[PDB]
Design a protein around this ligand. Structure first.
Ligand SMILES: [Mg+2]
Ligand SMILES: [Mg+2]
Ligand SMILES: [Mg+2]
Ligand SMILES: [Mg+2]
Ligand SMILES: [Mg+2]
Ligand SMILES: [Mg+2]
Ligand SMILES: [Mg+2]
Ligand SMILES: [Mg+2]
Ligand SMILES: [Mg+2]
Ligand SMILES: [Mg+2]
Ligand SMILES: [Mg+2]
Ligand SMILES: [Mg+2]
Ligand SMILES: [Mg+2]
Ligand SMILES: [Mg+2]
Ligand SMILES: [Mg+2]
Lengths: 271, 77, 149, 104
RNA sequence: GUUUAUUAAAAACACAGCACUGUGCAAACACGAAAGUGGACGUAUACGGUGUGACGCCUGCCCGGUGCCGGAAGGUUAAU
């Protein structure tokens, strides 16, 4: 539920929360937690590889069964929990034998529901089954690229992927960015969309909310000095030059897809 | 590192020469590849990080002839 | 790349043919599968005096086995139990080893590298043709019935 | 309760196990007090216009009085069965039992 | 909020926003002779870059130049 907060302090003026009563106000299921240390955008060399990352609140990793391998044994949804890691919400589930796991939350999913993965699974949001067993056109998410690898497609908070065509050992997938891609017809996928579809509706409001999420301030290019960046310098504001990376590479519209191993799977590029 | 284990081709240095003869230091790199080889004397495969030149050598001398040398050289394979 | 043939191979000739072929077809394929010997002078007269005549015998011990693996494999009523639905709707896809497992239980103790499928998946429950490659010449043809378990 | 009438269009290459589909539906009908009134197979039949790149079909007419919930279940069964191609759900006023003229 | 430790604390910077683009995941990108690592144990409601900088009203015309992007017939054309 979206809530425009009230302008008490300037800094609350534009804060838009996403209120959900479904979020289990408790401590999460401890045997599926593990330490994820921060990095600050620094590799093993200790150089800042990717910029702008650092600080932020301490986060513990949740072990999400993307691979979704319990088959035949049905599940039942214990509760819906917040995830500090990813944008989408997760749900502690429970099988018949006793194992609890986390999965992602589809949009049409509440607590106490029962789901099941397999090949003989029914078709309701929350099942996961290989896409040769799925009707064409039905929107899914959590799509594996290789069979058994674990879903790497439509895994954010408000995504889904449609299955536009099945033919032979391949299925054509309309990606969320609108890019027709073949996938092998044995990859598994989870039916329906994914829960927090209104995650894009939030507004962070103040700059400290950016800093809570580990994102340092981004300095714009043309503020710098010419030694620092190609956009640098200028008596005042001068920008007589083409918009490029700090490493000189053209940015506005210059494509960068160099992977030619996988061109036979892209049916059509995005638009 | 980059060593054709059959021959011994090491990456040697040299120069890139402009048409105005401005020399800059460069390297020359051998065309090494990993490749399995059907050692029929044991009926199995041995991988060797080998240049394409040594592939002709195994095509000329035979693989057990070459493996005699690296046992004689003592280089593990 | 001169090479002598340990067996008759289709697009280049019979046994005992010292043919120049390309390197990759010799090095990666014929030699490691043992279908040929590189025509070295130590192997020429090793072949031409001995294995030009030894392999004439050593091909007949396999060619006599060639008629066996289709003659006894003429029962053709191979039954595979597999879960499915209605008007087909198969649960689990029939694999090559699964066909190499029931025929293993009746007739040739057959390998996973013998099942040559024109179809592969075999979705619909019912009869399905299965070809065999027990030798490069003669093929065994068994139309296996898939049975809805 | 709610008198319905179901006719549906089975793919003619699936005409072999249509009474397999009929009687399981008939069991699913009568499993919830389903007052079946007629149960009529029409066999293969030429289409007036070719749906789905083919010209024959397989038609089964069926009068059913039933509660609505098992019918909506059955509606989804036609939706994912690809043996059936098209289906029809018509809310009938009463328990029609008289055979159609095109049964002949 | 931040900044020229030590002649400048602001209108400078950042900012939440907004927009462009790039990016199908072995992602783009960066550090790296390399393996690798960050990216991210994340997957387009994500990530990177660039722009302007809340909110409000807005955001007109020009593709000639210059970049960018697409089209391949032809012309041109390297080593070969
Ligand atoms: Mg960034
Ligand atoms: Mg920004
Ligand atoms: Mg800035
Ligand atoms: Mg300055
Ligand atoms: Mg510069
Ligand atoms: Mg000026
Ligand atoms: Mg000099
Ligand atoms: Mg102040
Ligand atoms: Mg400071
Ligand atoms: Mg000072
Ligand atoms: Mg200070
Ligand atoms: Mg001062
Ligand atoms: Mg990386
Ligand atoms: Mg500005
Ligand atoms: Mg062009």
């Amino acid at each position: 539920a979206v809530v425009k907060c009230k302008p008490t302090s300037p800094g609350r003026r534009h804060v838009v929360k996403v209120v959900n009563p479904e979020l289990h106000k408790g401590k999460p299921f401890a045997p599926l937690l593990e330490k994820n240390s921060k990095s600050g955008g620094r590799n093993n060399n200790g150089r800042i590889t990717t910029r702008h990352i650092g600080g932020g609140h301490k986060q513990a990793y949740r072990i999400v069964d993307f691979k979704r391998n319990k088959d035949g044994i049905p599940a039942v949804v214990e509760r819906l929990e917040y995830d500090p890691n990813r944008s989408a919400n997760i749900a502690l589930v429970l099988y018949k034998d006793g194992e609890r796991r986390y999965i992602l939350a589809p949009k049409g999913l509440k607590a106490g529901d029962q789901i099941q993965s397999g090949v003989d699974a029914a078709i309701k949001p929350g099942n996961t089954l290989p896409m040769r067993n799925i009707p064409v056109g039905s929107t899914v998410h959590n799509v594996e690229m290789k069979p058994g690898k674990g879903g790497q497609l439509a895994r954010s908070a408000g995504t889904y992927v449609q299955i536009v065509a099945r033919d032979g050992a391949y299925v054509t997938l309309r990606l969320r960015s609108g890019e027709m891609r073949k996938v092998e017809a044995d990859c598994r996928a989870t039916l329906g969309e994914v829960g927090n579809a209104e995650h894009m509706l939030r507004v962070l409001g103040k700059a400290g909310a950016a800093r809570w999420r580990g994102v340092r301030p981004t300095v714009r290019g043309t503020a710098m000095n010419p030694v620092d960046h190609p956009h640098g310098g200028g008596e005042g504001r001068n920008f007589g030059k083409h918009p490029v990376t700090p490493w000189g590479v053209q940015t506005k519209g210059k494509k960068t897809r160099s992977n030619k191993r996988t061109d036979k799977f892209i049916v059509r590029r995005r638009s | 590192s980059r060593v054709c284990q059959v021959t011994g081709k090491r990456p040697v240095t040299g120069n890139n020469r402009s048409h105005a003869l401005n020399a800059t230091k460069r390297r020359f790199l051998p065309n090494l590849h990993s490749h399995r080889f059907w050692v029929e004397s044991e009926k199995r495969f041995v991988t060797l990080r080998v240049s394409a030149k040594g592939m002709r050598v195994i095509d000329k001398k035979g693989i057990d002839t070459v493996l005699a040398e690296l046992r004689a050289r003592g280089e593990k394979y | 790349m001169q090479v002598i043939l340990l067996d008759k191979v289709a697009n280049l000739g019979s046994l005992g043919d010292q043919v120049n072929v390309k390197a990759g077809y010799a090095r990666n394929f014929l030699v490691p599968q043992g279908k040929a010997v590189p025509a070295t002078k130590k192997n020429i007269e090793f072949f031409e005096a001995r294995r030009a005549e030894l392999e004439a015998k050593l091909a007949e011990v396999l060619a006599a086995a060639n008629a066996r693996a289709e003659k006894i494999n003429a029962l053709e009523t191979v039954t595979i139990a597999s879960k499915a639905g209605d008007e087909g709707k198969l649960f689990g896809s029939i694999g090559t080893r699964d066909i190499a497992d029931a025929v293993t239980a009746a007739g040739v103790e057959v390998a996973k590298s013998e099942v040559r499928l024109p179809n592969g998946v075999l979705r619909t429950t019912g009869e399905h043709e299965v070809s065999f490659q027990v030798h490069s010449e003669v093929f065994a043809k068994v139309i296996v019935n898939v049975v809805a378990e | 309760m709610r008198h319905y009438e179901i006719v549906f269009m089975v793919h003619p290459d699936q005409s072999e196990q249509v009474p397999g589909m009929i009687e399981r539906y008939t069991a699913a009908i009568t499993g919830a007090e389903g007052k079946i009134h007629r149960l009529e197979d029409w066999g293969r039949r030429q289409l007036a216009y070719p749906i789905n790149k083919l010209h024959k079909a397989h038609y089964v007419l069926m009068n059913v009085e039933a509660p609505q919930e098992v019918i909506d279940e059955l509606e989804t069964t036609f939706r994912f069965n690809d043996a059936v191609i098209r289906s029809m759900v018509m809310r009938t006023k009463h328990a029609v039992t008289e055979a159609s003229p095109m049964v002949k």
